[PDB]
Amino acid sequence: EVETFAFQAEIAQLMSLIINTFYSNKEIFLRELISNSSDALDKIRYESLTDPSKLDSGKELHINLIPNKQDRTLTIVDTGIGMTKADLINNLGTIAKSGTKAFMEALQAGADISMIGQFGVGFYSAYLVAEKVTVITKHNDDEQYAWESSAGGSFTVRTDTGEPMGRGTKVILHLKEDQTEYLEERRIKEIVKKHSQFIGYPITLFVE
Amino acid sequence: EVETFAFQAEIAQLMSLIINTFYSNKEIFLRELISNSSDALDKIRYESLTDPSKLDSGKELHINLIPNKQDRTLTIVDTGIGMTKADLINNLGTIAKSGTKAFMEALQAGADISMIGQFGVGFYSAYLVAEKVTVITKHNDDEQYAWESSAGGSFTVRTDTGEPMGRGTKVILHLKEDQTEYLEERRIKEIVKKHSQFIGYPITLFVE
Ligand SMILES: COC(=O)c1c(C)n[nH]c1-c1ccco1
Ligand SMILES: COC(=O)c1c(C)n[nH]c1-c1ccco1
């Protein structure tokens, strides 16, 4: 069964700004999603120190970047803490409301889209490059879920029956037709080297 | 009763580097401690979304900066999640080991002390300016504790009987005699404005 939800007005407004504003420095989306993965990995690693069985769903803590020219997707996979259904439907949205409002205020005052990550809503920078984002995620206390949104003010969530991921989050960027440079090996390597050089987890860029 | 502990060799080595290296841009300590406070506040705010009673120990989420010329202290207080005794003695040290090692590697390779926060050990930048750091902290699942260290390879922890804080962390910087500019109103305001302008919690700078 697929459930369809309305984003809060403020988050929809943010997504439309990210989609509609002229802003050429789009490559920052990748830094933001890797940053999110690094935070999710810190969180599982911290929780494991007190409950080692939290890693029974997989010990390795890493980030993979997987381009696929045939599907026109760039996937960012981590083995971090994952997201529950409540995170997907409620918690992230309530955190995203006040971050959005601060970000909007900063932007009126001359801040730049590249600062989005300071307001805790850097995930939505995926819409610089993706016409659709699919997120597959699995938290230890919950089932594997697929969330998806092409913006336009709604998102879906369903229980995912695809390949079991163990634990973590996969963000699948369905790239806009003019953004396929982000499938290119040397372009991805360039961006990781520039913005993500000191991330404390191995980042493997897959080759096609 | 006061318990005295040895830092791991790697953390002691880091503290000695921070104390001994010539590095004039000391003001970054403040950005790092405010960043830590903002992360602790995000964590309590996130946990409250699923268990609202986590805020019974205080609803306001804020950061106060309190200079005291008579004591020569600058205190950074937050009402974030706080730290347990296990965090103080074990968990932070195990996180700090691999961050230290990456940071040391980056520094050999030409990275700068100001990047310390990327390796999750920005707390130790307090030793740029403080000859002693005292941290009073209170987590919902645990007692109020006072941790303290003047570096030299050891730290102490005791149960704190001072004024109850409700929930959060107070970092008290016993400033080096030549670092008292950090007690000055206009100097603190300058640094917050430069480095901490978009923190998503109210930061109140107390006046003397
Ligand atoms: C559907 O996924 C998300 O919304 C998401 C992921 C995968 N990481 N961070 C976020 C997020 C959303 C809002 C603030 O953070
Ligand atoms: C005694 O306090 C600490 O060590 C501390 C505080 C107060 N914030 N972050 C830290 C920390 C230490 C190591 C990595 O992070």
Curated annotation (Swiss-Prot), chains A, B:
Q: How is it modified after translation?
A: ISGylated.
Q: What is the effect of changing G82D?
A: Abolishes ATPase activity
Region Interaction with NR3C1, as annotated, extends over 1-208
Question: Which residues bind ATP per the record?
Answer: N36, D78, K97, F123
Give the subcellular location. Answer: Nucleus; Cytoplasm; Melanosome; Cell membrane
Q: Which residues carry this modification: N6-acetyllysine?
A: K43, K69
Q: State the domain notes.
A: The TPR repeat-binding motif mediates interaction with TPR repeat-containing proteins like the co-chaperone STUB1.
Q: Subunit structure, per the record? A: Homodimer. Identified in NR3C1/GCR steroid receptor-chaperone complexes formed at least by NR3C1, HSP90AA1 and a variety of proteins containing TPR repeats such as FKBP4, FKBP5, PPID, PPP5C or STIP1. Forms a complex containing HSP90AA1, TSC1 and TSC2; TSC1 is required to recruit TCS2 to the complex. The closed form interacts (via the middle domain and TPR repeat-binding motif) with co-chaperone TSC1 (via C-terminus). Interacts with TOM34. Interacts with TERT; the interaction, together with PTGES3, is required for correct assembly and stabilization of the TERT holoenzyme complex.
| Functional summary from the UniProt entry | Molecular chaperone that promotes the maturation, structural maintenance and proper regulation of specific target proteins involved for instance in cell cycle control and signal transduction. Undergoes a functional cycle that is linked to its ATPase activity which is essential for its chaperone activity. This cycle probably induces conformational changes in the client proteins, thereby causing their activation. Interacts dynamically with various co-chaperones that modulate its substrate recognition, ATPase cycle and chaperone function.
UniProt family annotation: Belongs to the heat shock protein 90 family.
**Protein name in the entry:** Heat shock protein HSP 90-alpha
Organism the protein comes from: Homo sapiens (Human)
Highest lineage ranks of the organism? Eukaryota, Metazoa, Chordata, Craniata, Vertebrata
Q: Which gene encodes it?
A: HSP90AA1
Portion of the full sequence shown: 16 to 223 of 732
